[PDB]
Amino acid sequence: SPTINFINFNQTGTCISLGTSKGFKIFNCEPFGKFYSEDSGGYAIVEMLFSTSLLALVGILRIINTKKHSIICEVTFPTSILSVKMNKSRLVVLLQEQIYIYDINTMRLLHTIETNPNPRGLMAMSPSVANSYLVYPSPPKKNGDVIVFNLETLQPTMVIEAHKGEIAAMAISFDGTLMATASDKGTIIRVFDIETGDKIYQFRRGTYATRIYSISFSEDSQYLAVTGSSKTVHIFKLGSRHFASLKLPVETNSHVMTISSIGSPIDIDTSEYPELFEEPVMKMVPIRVVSSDGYLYNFVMDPERGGDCLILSQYSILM
Amino acid sequence: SPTINFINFNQTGTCISLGTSKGFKIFNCEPFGKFYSEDSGGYAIVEMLFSTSLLALVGILRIINTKKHSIICEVTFPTSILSVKMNKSRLVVLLQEQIYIYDINTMRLLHTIETNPNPRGLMAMSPSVANSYLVYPSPPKIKNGDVIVFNLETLQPTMVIEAHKGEIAAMAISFDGTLMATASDKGTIIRVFDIETGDKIYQFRRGTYATRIYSISFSEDSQYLAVTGSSKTVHIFKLGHSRHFASLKLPVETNSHVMTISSIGSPIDIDTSEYPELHEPVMKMVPIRVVSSDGYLYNFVMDPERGGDCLILSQYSILMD
Amino acid sequence: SPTINFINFNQTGTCISLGTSKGFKIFNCEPFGKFYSEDSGGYAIVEMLFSTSLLALVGILRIINTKKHSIICEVTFPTSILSVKMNKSRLVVLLQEQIYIYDINTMRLLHTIETNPNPRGLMAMSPSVANSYLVYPSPPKVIKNGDVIVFNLETLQPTMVIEAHKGEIAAMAISFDGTLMATASDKGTIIRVFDIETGDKIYQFRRGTYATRIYSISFSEDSQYLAVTGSSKTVHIFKLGHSRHFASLKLPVETNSHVMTISSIGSPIDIDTSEYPELHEPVMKMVPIRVVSSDGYLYNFVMDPERGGDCLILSQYSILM
Amino acid sequence: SPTINFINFNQTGTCISLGTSKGFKIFNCEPFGKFYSEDSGGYAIVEMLFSTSLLALVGILRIINTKKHSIICEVTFPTSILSVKMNKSRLVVLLQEQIYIYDINTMRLLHTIETNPNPRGLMAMSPSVANSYLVYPSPPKKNGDVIVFNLETLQPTMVIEAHKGEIAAMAISFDGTLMATASDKGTIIRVFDIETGDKIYQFRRGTYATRIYSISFSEDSQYLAVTGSSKTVHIFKLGSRHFASLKLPVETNSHVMTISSIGSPIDIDTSEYPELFEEPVMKMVPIRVVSSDGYLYNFVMDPERGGDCLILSQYSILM
């Protein structure tokens, strides 16, 4: 079982992108299966578009098409690549102190932003081309300043004073309307309107010092998912206190990094699961949590009650 | 330590077959020892009969007699072999969409079944010639968990079992060919059907959340049924008649990403003086042997009355020695 | 992931110093962060004062101010340095057979002590100027092997000789105010704490069940608890509010057993029981414990001062990442 | 902590030779301390004489002197070296199908024995020059036949039908008078007299299938210790049922191979250990068990009561 180096969903949360020290793999979420794999070598970042057989490979930057098994182009950077995100219009590569913006169609360079250092490789992109924005932190060389950069016209739009301390995680909704950020102490969540900059929502989490790792919106932006180092995942409703919580089984490895993504509500069959969770079918919002130890976890929450969420399944990546 | 690709007991559970990336090995169970080995190359499938020095080897089909060190015959197929099972009467080869049946004696081809694709290479075959039966899944081209009961003696299907709503994940047949147990890909419900009539006899619930199942195996006396899954835990269901009767927990050090196959042996006498079971000097303990894909063997004991969590006595290594 | 050769807290326990084979790093504890780092070379001793941007760096002795990025001084020694400690008044450098004491401000040499060889580089420094004491072991030169010398840094004259243990001393620790001293023999079975001004042994603790090595000892800020870590991969807490260890810290099973582990005890803080099912008032004070190991991980625990017992683990970071 | 590859006592049981994937180490037993170490490379076989600064090095054969830091000689063999043993007069190298015998002084080759294949690299050699005997199994090409070879005159002396099954472990006492064997069943231990060949003692062990790994004689030959895969070590008295037993603590790793060596009886201080085992001092026979995980253990047995033995210390090798 080779060690993995990168794990991430796609822009819709219906796939798993995973790259090991020996190769990379592409999974699925509801009809679980191994769509693709190559045992080429160590891969540090494997990012995928909205399916469409498009991938970006970063060695432990190359763009490949898995259907045609060809290589579109290769680009080098003076420093190590820290993060890559994509939408249907723009390609952005983030480095230690520079942000590169590319046209996803032509591959031509469009603009380069000189930013203050980002050791954590933090950026967030709106995946919809209707409101194509880019947000990145602006530390002073006034700590949690986030630069709302408009990729459509290649000009910044406004600067938001998000938090007094360092920003830990940022995410943009699917429609590109809202932005959410979390401070380095990981106790307060702030959600901003990217158009005006007003603070709309504030959430409490992490009663003790548990750092926040990842934040993700649902497809309809109804729910917000935050994963930290406490092996517990909180759910906040964008309709204060958390709405629902996820408790991973204790037997799991604790030396893991966990991300999450919330999908559209689906129907689950009671007869399939006799012991737990026992109306043949109920509407339950699916939550998918993948950890670096190589396991995909599926949880479901009742849209009215909330509370601690059951685990329907636990599948094994890398096998 | 070479990577191993295949582990299977014999049809009686008294031997161990195994295949590495460099060759294959054959062990024994009660007087543990390495009967045979061969450093040829990558072996994917190593199947053995009831001892008798007959082997089937599939590289990563050739049948070899190990006592004579000779080759009986070699059979080629258009596609890769996914499973091979034997009894003392018939030889069965499964491809992803085709099933081949051979006579073990004369080795002439007897039948061929064109089946819907089986990417998992699932099968269950009765090892006794008195009740020689073959069962394989029949997915459509909700009618997903249909299993075809095929009689090997006359080479004709007998009945169609509407086993499960979803795809079948694992299937096994008792030693006498009387019963069959299947499980869906969710691994939450274990069902047992009588192959003679087709009526469902037993239905067991396994675990709480849906997790993958690796293999199912009956006892030699058909008293208990063993299931192994991704939970790093092995459950035992008592068929003397729901919830599992007794469960097997591997040591916490064991890697969780390991394939595990198990087998249940006949009850034998153990000394309670040496082992503080927590007392008569000796009581009959049912032995269970569990081998993992990392290369270790585990010996447990089960109390037919008490059941519960089973104590572990010893542990070996199958790689090296 | 480069190998790390040295980890220690500051004299207050709110910071982290660390030395790799490629450089050194400085962290923080409550609002966790990386204050400083340089990829200069191999570092074996990285000791810091009470913040104040003052460091002692020994290659695999140089005093560097991290805020100014300048060099206060550079001093050489005939042999390799084994330990360095500071308070806001004095600086101590220990070689295998010699002890050098420097004034922290003027940096001129004040005293030199010729001691019997200490290959283990063991000392203990009181961080308060009111009770500035240094203690070092004095074994006979080749039963009375565990003799330790209580040395006063203020007047540069020894005060008394303590017959600590029968065997060689393995670890020493002085409380924040310089009132108490704790010692550990090479067998690690008995922990003894002495009152430095009077010399009487106040408390005696039994550690574990069998003899095993001890890595380090450290007091709490308020001298309420004493923390010892040993090769059994278990950390014990002894309550000095007054035998058997009061509370025990069990690291996760997946952790390597061959890890140097140092710990520290912080002041009690308010934690929300709604988030953490301790097993209930919304908030209760729980003493936080930070345990950093040589593999490069930090572990946060909480102890209930009344209940004590086995401690729950809240979170785990990863130093060097 | 680099993985170790080889553990062995010296011919007297007062020293520890250990080989890592990075180098080799030489420990001591009663004043436990690190005598020597070298970070040269992987070593698979490290054998030491009765102190005397003599070592045998086999790569993962070189004879080196640790005090002079020089090499005595280097000899190669057609096949991989399986085992090496020494006394004060002879040097023995065993391959799969051959046994090489050397004069430890002149380094000249003396004799070569053609044997049936021994994949386990099994032997037993008498450490005393007065009765210098060598034994090695002789399987057919009648399974447990062992050839008693006289190293003094370089001629075999007698053949004993030890066991009906394959031989698993052999050991010879310090004075070279007695011999011990164990079959692959691990249930029967038989002790032979080399002079005559008669079966002297027979001991019962291993009620279930636990293979026997190593057998060792005490210095006075009063006790015989056998170690298996069951995490338990039994003690037999050469004055049926085992005399005493060693139970390692449960928290230890189970993927361990333990060897043992019983030393001369010594006195222990009861005051040093208040928490366990509570006369100021009493005579107790020390037993040393080192495992492949890197831990050394010291047990003590009361020569009259026997029974389960207490554990005094657990020191961490390799650290």
UniProtKB/Swiss-Prot annotation, chains A, D:
Q: Where are the WD repeats?
A: 162-202, 207-239
Q: Which InterPro entries match?
A: PROPPIN, WD40/YVTN_repeat-like_dom_sf, WD40_repeat_dom_sf, WD40_rpt
Q: Which SMART domains match?
A: WD40
The principal location of this protein is: membrane
Result, substituting R190A: Impairs membrane-association
Q: Which GO terms describe its biological process?
A: 1-phosphatidyl-1D-myo-inositol 3,5-bisphosphate metabolic process; autophagosome assembly; autophagy of mitochondrion; cytoplasm to vacuole targeting by the Cvt pathway; glycophagy; late endosome to vacuole transport; macroautophagy; nucleophagy
Tell me where it resides. Answer: Preautophagosomal structure membrane; Vacuole membrane; Endosome membrane
Task: Read off the Pfam families from this record.
Answer: PROPPIN
Q: Does the keyword Transcription regulation apply?
A: no
Q: Name one GO molecular function term.
A: protein-macromolecule adaptor activity
Instruction: Tell me yes or no: is Phosphoprotein among this UniProt entry's keywords.
Output: yes
- Membrane topology designation: Peripheral membrane protein
What keywords would UniProt list here?
Autophagy, Endosome, Membrane, Phosphoprotein, Protein transport, Repeat, Transport, Vacuole, WD repeat
Q: What is the effect of changing S230A?
A: Impairs membrane-association
Write out the transmembrane intervals. Answer: none
The entry's other comment says:
Present with 1560 molecules/cell in log phase SD medium.
State whether it acts alone or in a complex, and with which partners, per the record.
Component of the PI(3,5)P2 regulatory complex, composed of ATG18, FIG4, FAB1, VAC14 and VAC7. VAC14 nucleates the assembly of the complex and serves as a scaffold. Interacts with ATG2, the ATG2-ATG18 complex being essential for autophagosome formation. Interacts with ATG9. Also interacts with VAC17.
Which function does this protein serve?
Phosphoinositide binding protein that plays a key role in cytoplasm to vacuole transport (Cvt) vesicle formation, pexophagy and starvation-induced autophagy. Component of the PI(3,5)P2 regulatory complex that regulates both the synthesis and turnover of phosphatidylinositol 3,5-bisphosphate (PtdIns(3,5)P2). Involved in correct ATG9 trafficking to the pre-autophagosomal structure. With ATG2, protects ATG8 from ATG4-mediated cleavage. May negatively regulate FAB1 activity by sequestering or masking VAC7 from FAB1. Plays an important role in osmotically-induced vacuole fragmentation.
Q: What is known of its domains?
A: The 377 first amino acids might form a beta-propeller domain involved in specific binding to phosphatidylinositol 3,5-bisphosphate (PIP2), leading to the association of the protein to the membrane. Association to the membrane can also occur through binding to phosphatidylinositol 3-monophosphate (PI3P). The L/FRRG motif is essential for the cytoplasm to vacuole transport (Cvt) pathway, for the recruitment of ATG8 and ATG16 to the PAS in nutrient-rich medium, and for its recruitment to and dissociation from the PAS under starvation conditions.
Which family does this protein fall into?
Belongs to the WD repeat PROPPIN family.
Q: What name goes with this protein?
A: Autophagy-related protein 18
The gene that this protein is the product of is ATG18
Curated annotation (Swiss-Prot), chain C:
GO cellular component terms attached to this protein's record:
cell periphery; cytosol; endosome; endosome membrane; fungal-type vacuole membrane; PAS complex; phagophore; phagophore assembly site
Look up the domain of life of the source.
Answer: Eukaryota
* UniProt comment concerning the protein's domains: The 377 first amino acids might form a beta-propeller domain involved in specific binding to phosphatidylinositol 3,5-bisphosphate (PIP2), leading to the association of the protein to the membrane. Association to the membrane can also occur through binding to phosphatidylinositol 3-monophosphate (PI3P). The L/FRRG motif is essential for the cytoplasm to vacuole transport (Cvt) pathway, for the recruitment of ATG8 and ATG16 to the PAS in nutrient-rich medium, and for its recruitment to and dissociation from the PAS under starvation conditions.
Pfam name, any one: PROPPIN
Give the location in the cell.
Preautophagosomal structure membrane; Vacuole membrane; Endosome membrane
Which family does the record assign?
Answer: Belongs to the WD repeat PROPPIN family.
Give the species this sequence originates from.
Answer: Saccharomyces cerevisiae (strain ATCC 204508 / S288c) (Baker's yeast)
Q: What is the effect of changing R192A?
A: Impairs membrane-association
- Name used for this protein in its record: Autophagy-related protein 18
Give the main localization category. membrane
Q: What is the lineage of its organism?
A: Eukaryota, Fungi, Dikarya, Ascomycota, Saccharomycotina
